[PDB]
Amino acid sequence: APPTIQQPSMSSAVALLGQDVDFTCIVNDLGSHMVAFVKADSPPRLLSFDEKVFRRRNKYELKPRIGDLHNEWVLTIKNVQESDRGNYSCQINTEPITLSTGELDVKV
Amino acid sequence: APPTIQQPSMSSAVALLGQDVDFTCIVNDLGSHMVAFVKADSPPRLLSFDEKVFRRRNKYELKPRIGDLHNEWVLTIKNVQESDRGNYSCQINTEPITLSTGELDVKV
Numbered sequence: 296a297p298p299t300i301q302q303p304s305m306s307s308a309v310a311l312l313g314q315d316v317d318f319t320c321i322v323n324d325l326g327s328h329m330v331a332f333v334k335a336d337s338p339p340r341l342l343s344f345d346e347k348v349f350r351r352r353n354k355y356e357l358k359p360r361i362g363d364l365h366n367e368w369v370l371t372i373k374n375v376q377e378s379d380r381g382n383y384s385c386q387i388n389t390e391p392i393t394l395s396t397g398e399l400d401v402k403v
Numbered sequence: 404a405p406p407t408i409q410q411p412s413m414s415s416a417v418a419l420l421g422q423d424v425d426f427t428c429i430v431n432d433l434g435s436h437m438v439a440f441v442k443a444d445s446p447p448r449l450l451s452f453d454e455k456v457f458r459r460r461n462k463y464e465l466k467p468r469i470g471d472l473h474n475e476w477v478l479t480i481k482n483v484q485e486s487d488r489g490n491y492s493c494q495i496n497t498e499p500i501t502l503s504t505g506e507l508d509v510k511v
């Protein structure tokens with residue numbers, strides 16, 4: 296079986312300023328494939344690769360390979376701000392690609 | 404010194420269908436920081452992380468840490484197609500971030 300993303304994954308969310316929000320990507324049959332979290336933006340921002348956050352460890356947290364099956368990948372956006380509004384995706388390096396996207400709406 | 408991107412890096416380019424095109428990111432003072440190449444799209448696509456292409460090794464090639472200074476990172480897009488049009492960025496996990504973007508125009 297190829298990797299698939301179990302649903303619900305990457306559910307859209309809303310938040311007030313300062314609230315913490317999680318996006319969860321649950322991957323079935325990941326095997327040796329890699330998971331990356333990205334924010335859609337111009338330019339986009341890599342947020343995590345495999346088991347490590349790319350940068351800003353106090354802003355983004357990644358709990359990779361958790362859950363009962365070691366197959367839940369939870370990205371936390373801490374202290375949400377207006378600049379965090381937008382679309383977050385988790386993507387797996389399959390051919391063809393496998394991905395799931397959800398929106399963060401920020402209320403002031 | 405923090406990482407910086409030497410200019411010219413990530414120069415815009417044009418191509419006919421089937422042509423190969425390179426984007427080069429030349430990083431001064433990279434240290435232990437990581438380089439990622441991303442395509443802006445909805446959703447964006449991670450193309451490479453550190454020294455390895457994310458996926459589609461026959462489509463994207465990465466020559467990481469080449470040049471005289473071992474500080475040129477060259478991403479090749481092989482066999483350019485209409486779907487390859489858009490903005491390619493290299494980004495380094497500094498705080499704050501360091502990045503450079505160039506456009507690929509595809510002619511039919």
Ligand SMILES: *[C@@H]1O[C@H](CO)[C@@H](O)[C@H](O)[C@H]1NC(C)=O
Nearest residue numbers: 335380381382396397398445
């Ligand atoms: C996120 O993507 C949806 C399409 O799935 C789009 O309608 C929405 O505007 C995007 N959110 C942004 C750009 O903040």
Ligand SMILES: *[C@@H]1O[C@H](CO)[C@@H](O)[C@H](O)[C@H]1NC(C)=O
Nearest residue numbers: 337443488489490504505506
């Ligand atoms: C790439 O980004 C530039 C802004 O720097 C924008 O004008 C252009 O439309 C983009 N190219 C696309 C979306 O193909």
